[PDB]
Amino acid sequence: VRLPGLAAMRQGTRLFTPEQGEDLREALRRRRGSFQTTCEVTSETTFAAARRLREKASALAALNFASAKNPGGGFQAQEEDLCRGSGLYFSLTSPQAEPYYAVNRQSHSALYTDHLIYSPQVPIFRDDAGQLLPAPVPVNIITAPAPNAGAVAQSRPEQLPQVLPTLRERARRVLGVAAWMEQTHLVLGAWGCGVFRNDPAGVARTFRELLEGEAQGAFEHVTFAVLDNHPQHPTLGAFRRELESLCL
Ligand SMILES: Nc1ncnc2c1ncn2[C@@H]1O[C@H](COP(=O)(O)OP(=O)(O)OC[C@H]2O[C@H](O)[C@H](O)[C@@H]2O)[C@@H](O)[C@H]1O
C-alpha cells in the first residue's frame, strides 16, 4: 500500500543544482520587499510549528536539517523526526533527487555541495508524540546540509574558516529555493547546531543578516522552531538574542 499524497509528492520533488545558485539569488530579488515580514522564535518542533501556521498560511515551507550522504541521516535529531511523522523520506529517495546524495558522497569535504531538495506537499501524518493526526497536513520542505563543522575539525582543519562562508552561501540558497517556489510562510531553526556542531549564535546571526538583507520582505512570516530540551535553553536562547531585532 502507498499512503495518500505520497505519489504526487515524489513526482513534484525537484533538485536544485549548484549552477542554479545564480537563478536562486534572482528569485530572492523578485520576492524582496513583498511583505512586512514578522518574525518569531519558539521552542516548537519543526512540524508542530508548521501545523500551527498551516491554516493561515498561503504557501508553507520547512527546512530539513538534512544529512548530505544519507536520506534520513542514518537515524534527537530533526531530520530523523521529520521522517518518522511525515512523507519526507519517500521524497528524498525519489530517483530525480539521487544526484544530491551521489555528488555529496564523492565530495571529499565535510563542507558538502550546494544541492538542495524541494519536496512539495509533504504530508505530516503524526504529531510529536507519534500519534496519527485526524487528517494529514501538507508542508513543502527544503533539504540542504549545513556544513559538518565537527567532521571538518577532525579531517581538514585548514577548512574551518570556510564553515561560516558556507553556511551563509547555503542559507541564501535555502531562502532562494523558498522565494523561487513563492512560499509565504517559513519554518527555520537551529540548522547545523546539533550533530553537525556549528555554533547556534553563528547560524542565527547568518539568518538575521539575510532577512534584513537580500531576503528582507521575501516572506510573510518566518518561524524559528528550535526544540531545546535542556532546562537553561542554550540553542533557543541564542536565537532569541540574535533575532530580537527582527521580532519587534
Ligand atoms: N524535531 C526538531 N524540531 C525542531 N528542532 C529540533 C528538532 N530536533 C532537534 N532540534 C534542534 O536543532 C538542532 C540541530 O538539529 P540536528 O538534528 O542536530 O541537525 P544538524 O543540522 O545539526 O545535523 C544534521 C545531521 O544530523 C542529523 O542526523 C541529520 O540526519 C544529519 O545527519 C538541535 O540542537 C535541536 O536544538
Numbering used by the authors: 29 to 103, 108 to 280
Publication passage describing the model:
Therefore, we attempted to obtain crystals of DrPARG in complex with ADP-ribose. Crystals were found in several similar conditions, but they belonged to different space groups. Notably, the 28 N-terminal residues of these solved structures from different space groups, including P21, P32, P3221, and P212121, were not well defined in the electron density maps, which suggests that this phenomenon did not result from crystal packing. In fact, the missing residues located in the intrinsically disordered N-terminal region of DrPARG and might be highly flexible. The structural flexibility may reflect the multiple space groups observed in X-ray crystallography because packing patterns are constantly influenced by the flexible regions during crystallization.
Despite the abundance of PARP1, most of the PAR generated by DNA damage is rapidly degraded, with a half-life of less than 1 min by poly (ADP-ribose) glycohydrolase (PARG). The radio-resistant bacterium D. radiodurans encodes a PARG homolog, DrPARG, whose expression is upregulated after radiation damage, so it might play an important role in DNA repair. Our study demonstrates that DrPARG is involved in catalyzing the breakdown of endogenous PAR and DNA repair in D. radiodurans. From observing the structural peculiarities of DrPARG, we show that although previously thought to be an obligate exo-glycohydrolase, bacterial PARG could exert both exo- and endo-glycohydrolase functions.
